[PDB]
């Protein structure tokens, strides 16, 4: 789809069967979803935003459908104030910005 | 323009004929620029995400020119690592996202 920014681009994601709500963001390099259970291996890790770092879990090759395109790769799980899209999965369904 | 995400969407702006780079951000309601002494009237808020929240001075109606593209509107400004247009200033210019 072609998505306006007048509100916030919040859009569903299909993530280990289950339905939840976040938001495209261009500014994040990296996926970072609130605190929940996936399966496998993960390691520790630290990632930086507006307002200092923060601890985070790094679980690699996940399967992440958002908003009907399908995505595998690195998603980050930690206090993060919102579920984020980053670009290391935008940039797999194929997502620019235009004007 | 079209702009893809394998690097940060970084474009030049300039508020004052000072030029600065800044992220096309979809992922901030608001446009956040790095400490710079503006003229004017400015209220003080305080923004979050990742790592927790920073104080801010909120100056509504200024012109900016992002990407050859004129808009006027809030600028937060403060100790942000990064300056940030957000959705309030992306919409002026004509932003979408699009996959
Ligand atoms: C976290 C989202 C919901 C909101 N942020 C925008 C995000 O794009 C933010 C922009 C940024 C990049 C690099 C350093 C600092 C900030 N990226 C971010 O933290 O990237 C991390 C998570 C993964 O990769 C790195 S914000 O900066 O906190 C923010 C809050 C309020 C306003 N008005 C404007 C901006």
Same mark, same amino acid.
């Given at each position: 789809? &072609? *998505?306006?920014?007048?509100? @916030?681009?919040?859009?569903?994601? @299909?993530?280990?069967? &289950?339905?939840?709500?976040?938001?495209?963001? !261009?500014?994040?390099?990296?996926?970072?979803?609130?605190?929940?259970?996936?399966?496998?291996?993960?390691?520790?890790?630290? *990632?930086?935003? *507006?307002?200092?770092?923060?601890?985070? @879990?790094?679980?690699?090759? +996940?399967?992440?459908?958002?908003?009907?395109?399908?995505? +595998?790769?690195?998603?980050?799980?930690?206090? !993060?104030?919102?579920?984020?899209?980053? @670009?290391?999965?935008? !940039? &797999? *369904?194929?997502?620019?910005?235009?004007?």
């Amino acid at each position: 789809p &072609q *998505i306006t920014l007048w509100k @916030r681009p919040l859009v569903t994601i @299909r993530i280990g069967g &289950q339905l939840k709500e976040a938001l495209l963001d !261009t500014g994040a390099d990296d996926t970072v979803l609130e605190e929940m259970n996936l399966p496998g291996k993960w390691k520790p890790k630290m *990632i930086g935003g *507006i307002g200092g770092f923060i601890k985070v @879990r790094q679980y690699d090759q +996940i399967p992440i459908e958002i908003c009907g395109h399908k995505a +595998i790769g690195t998603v980050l799980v930690g206090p !993060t104030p919102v579920n984020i899209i980053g @670009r290391n999965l935008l !940039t &797999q *369904i194929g997502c620019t910005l235009n004007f």
